[PDB]
Design a protein around this nucleic acid. Structure first.
Lengths: 189, 190, 190, 196
DNA sequence: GTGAGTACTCAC
DNA sequence: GTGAGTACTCAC
């Protein structure tokens, strides 16, 4: 309830220009409209607030990705949708993107960056899974190693996302995606 | 100078280590160097300008080596390959400076610094973009894809490899499997 | 309230003490109040603001009592007397705050505060410079010298006493021999 | 020869220390670094003319110590009329303070806030001297012109010095806006009216 | 509220 | 160059 309210504020601050700098328990409480003391009746620490945010991001993505796998059977189409999804989610959630790129995690304990990594390794697995199944589904797999292909695709995504945070959200990820995808598809060999 | 240059290299070494995961205090810096905090401000008006110097060293190393690549190689594709290998390579042998390049190290510091890194990336991208646009005078046939899109596509992959190199605390070497990766990127040059 | 005034007062206490000759560091002030420096800014943004309030409590005490004197005494000379005694008397009862009036405590702090005190003394010299001109009203006779060049003469004396008071580590109490001094002032009320 | 060159760099420092105390930056601290920059040298190459920053104000006070004590021991001899003596001792303070605004910050004690308390003590002994010397001019009136003063000579001297310290204080405070030697020809009659 | 901290100053 | 300051921070 209120717990949801605090986190909702932490996102807009993470999205705002202030997301560039540190986000202290003090200004957060201010953003909310409550005291720092009450803030800690909902969380044991600031790190716990990001933990909730990382779970939201992960849940959001994994759930979306799993739907993709059920709505689309074609390997290429699955990859395209997954990519368009990571870009789309980041674009719709600039504040949370700073968490995905790791910038917002610079101030908190390094354990949080460890979780986001697992998210990435989790997503990359799914990418590697989709690639691997091109064999069973289409008869012929890829000449290139799947782990290398998955990482190649994922790298482009992180590239667009960090480029998104870096330029203060001027460089929108899904910008010219339909012109960019043919480029990415040419790597699937 | 004996201290000034030395200072910036202690800065990078610290950034390269686990200390680079968090704020770099004038305290630790001066201690790492072997002097007092006041000694630091004998060569720098602010810690900000210490990062400014580090960003200028990065800006030089990259632009300089790119200009050499352009003079030592005339093939459009070979240029792109070397430029990319350069960014990845530089990032790998300078983990500390990469934290600055990926913007993570600039989070504890002044906003303006991040803007500088933006100007640098736009500089490298303008170079990539120029290289691509020269393909049609040099080879008659241009690229079907918008050069501005191709350049950003290439640089996007580079930032991706650098950013991930930082995530894994430098365990994911940016140049690992480059010769295997390049053919993939080469296929994008449509 | 309790912890806000508690500080503002502990400040005046340190200003009035012999340490008032030195800079009042937030470390000293805090330790004086028996708390942490972080507790200070729990009640104040900038230490400059503490002096801002202290300078207000000085302008809200003097400017007040001045108005009264003008409303509870319609004698041109009985007005100047009460006012001079007020300045001298107030400065004496508040040695620390006097250090602000003289501008010595404001040396360590922002340049603005001095300008603010400057204004206080321009208001006091204002309600001083009119009681005078009101001689050609109630008494039908004027002053040889310009009200300007004599309201300044009177205030100069007051400032002198406060400065001596501070200068002499509060030995020269501003109101010592006042009844013997006042006639000497009146002699200038030509 | 060599000592004569150890004062061309030295006093050149005081010319600046004074110049700084005088400019708009007299209302804030004067550190060793920002001074060395004005002369044109380091800080280490500074303490080879002064073993401290205190010692700079010393020799700097000595100048005002001597300027007035000299200018007063002369105003006596070359004047016999009690009043005229007082009027010119008073003006000496107001003039010398307007002639050296930077040094005035020292007289008023403001510039001294950053340095050692013992500097204020010195400036104090100076005032106690200017006053005692005012006290003599008032106590000598009897032996020279029959009758002395109604009011206590001590109270009168302090009453006169108070105005001076007041004027100088206004001077320093208003950022050297109120010139002490202003309308001194019109102010005096009022001070002398206290000479009862 | 607070212990440890924070980039920067200062006179020797 | 430096040891001790400086006003002000921050997560808890």
């Amino acid at each position: 309830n209120r717990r949801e309210e605090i986190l909702q504020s932490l996102a807009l601050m993470l999205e705002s220009s202030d997301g560039s700098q540190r986000i202290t328990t003090a200004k957060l409480a201010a953003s909310v409209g409550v005291s720092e003391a009450a803030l800690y009746r909902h969380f044991p620490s600031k790190t716990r607030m990001f933990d909730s945010l990382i779970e939201f991001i992960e849940d959001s993505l994994i759930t979306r990705i799993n739907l993709i796998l059920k709505d689309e059977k074609d390997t290429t189409a699955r990859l395209r949708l997954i990519v368009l999804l990571l870009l789309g989610f980041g674009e719709r959630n600039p504040g949370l993107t700073r968490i995905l790129t790791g910038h917002a995690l610079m101030f908190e304990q390094d354990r949080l960056q460890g979780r986001i990594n697992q998210l990435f390794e989790r997503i990359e697995a799914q990418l590697r899974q989709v690639l691997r199944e091109k064999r069973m589904r289409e008869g012929e797999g890829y000449t290139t190693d799947e782990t290398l292909l998955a990482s190649q695709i994922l790298a482009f995504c992180e590239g667009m996302l960090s480029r998104f945070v870096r330029s203060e959200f001027k460089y929108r990820p899904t910008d010219d995606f339909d012109a960019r995808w043919p480029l990415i598809a040419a790597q699937l060999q």
